[PDB]
Structures are given as C-alpha cells and as structure tokens.
Design a binder for these strands. Structure first.
Ligand SMILES: [Zn+2]
Ligand SMILES: [Zn+2]
Ligand SMILES: [Zn+2]
Ligand SMILES: [Zn+2]
Lengths: 70, 69
DNA sequence: CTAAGTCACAGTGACCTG
DNA sequence: TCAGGTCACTGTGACTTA
C-alpha cells in the first residue's frame, strides 16, 4: 500500500489486484488488451522507474509474477 | 549482402564510416547527448526486434563498430 | 552516393470518463 | 474507489532534400 509492486515507483492505487503506478497499470491494461514482446537479453531484466520502458517482456512477466490478473 | 554492423538488419548504405540500417544511422545521429541505461547487464543481443528495447547497448555497439560523430 | 531533415507512426503514463 | 479511455509527449525509421 505505497510503492509499485512492479517497478517500485510511487504507486497510485490498487490496479488489477496489486498496488501499482499509472505506468504499470496502463501497461498491463494494453498487454491484456492485445499486443509479441521481445526481451533484449536473458528474460531477467531489472524492472524499475528507468528500465520498465526498455523491456516489455520482463515487465509483463513481472506484472503477472506480482499478482496482476485480467 | 550488407548487414547493419550494429543490429544486423539489412544495411541501407555506408553511414558514419560503417554499414548501417536507417535505424541505427538515425539513432546514432540522435544520440550524439543522450545517456541511456541497460535493463539487463550491458550484453544485450541487439537485432531488428530488440534494438528499440535497449538503447544503452545499441549506442555501445555504435561506438564499438566504429561509428564516428 | 551519403548527410541531414522530415514526419507518420506507435508506446507511454498522467489524466479523464464511466 | 478502480477500470478503461485518452491523448500530448516522445523515439523510431523510412523516405526526402541537399
Ligand atoms: Zn510501476
Ligand atoms: Zn528482459
Ligand atoms: Zn541497425
Ligand atoms: Zn542492454
């Protein structure tokens, strides 16, 4: 009930079942809406305030890991 | 056939002293004063489908391959 | 030819509507 | 309150001009 469970940025509220920022909220929104994300490395990127935009594959992976649901 | 020295995509021509696709050419141009951060460990596999994801490793490779500002 | 500009296009997220 | 939209901002790269 404070920080984003996905990128650890200031979370706005409870979105999709986890406390998240508007960024991760919108991201999951679109991801479940319809999109192929490609990880530029080893499917183990560090998702945070300044890396979430870089890897969409690991960001989505994390969205699910932390509990977000459709 | 020529391939982009940075991302292996079909190169458009010889840009900045190296063979590059239009993407890496414009990117390099834009970069030269952007400071980037790799999402992983600075060893990304930069190709057509991932060059947009890591900008740090893209610019790294731009210099590595000999692109001159 | 390449350098350099151009601009439609697509993702992001802060804000808005329901 | 949150889901789902929205749209200005921005980076991209294919194409145009010099
Ligand atoms: Zn977040
Ligand atoms: Zn990744
Ligand atoms: Zn390239
Ligand atoms: Zn990288």
């Amino acid at each position: 009930t404070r920080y984003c469970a996905v990128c650890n940025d200031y979370a706005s509220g409870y979105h999709y079942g986890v406390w998240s920022c508007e960024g991760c909220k919108a991201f999951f929104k679109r991801s479940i809406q319809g999109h192929d994300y490609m990880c530029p490395a080893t499917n183990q990127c560090t998702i945070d305030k300044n890396r979430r935009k870089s890897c969409q594959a690991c960001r989505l992976r994390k969205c699910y890991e932390v509990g977000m649901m459709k």
